[PDB]
């Protein structure tokens, strides 16, 4: 048992396998336009 794990990790690294304790998602690129903004603005004033 305990010695078999110390040699397993060396095998899995050769194929890029990892144990299920060590997996997560990734992040996408982004859209083709900038992020929108809330209803906050100035108010028109005379010269």
């Amino acid at each position: 048992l305990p010695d078999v794990a110390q040699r397993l990790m060396q095998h899995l690294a050769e194929h890029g396998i990892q144990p299920a304790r060590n997996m997560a998602e990734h992040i996408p690129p982004a859209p083709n336009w900038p992020a929108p903004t809330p209803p906050v603005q100035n108010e028109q004033s005379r010269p």
Binding site: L1, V4, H11, H15, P19, A20
Partner: protein
């Protein structure tokens, strides 16, 4: 008819994966130790690699001595 020598104890297949229902007293016990899950054992692309290790570096007689 005939069977393996250095292996044969392990129940794994390239279509379905390791046989959890009948797994060896060492097999599942390592999988729970290094951190592997039953999903990877049923993965024809991950379980294959995990099995190829036992076929060369595990072995029920090889781990005994």
């Amino acid at each position: 008819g005939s069977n393996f020598q250095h292996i044969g104890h392990v129940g794994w297949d390239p279509n379905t994966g390791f046989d959890l229902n009948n797994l060896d007293p060492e097999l599942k016990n390592l999988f729970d130790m290094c951190g592997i899950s039953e999903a990877q054992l049923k993965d024809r692309e991950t379980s294959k690699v995990i099995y190829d290790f036992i076929e060369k570096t595990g072995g029920v007689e090889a781990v005994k001595n």
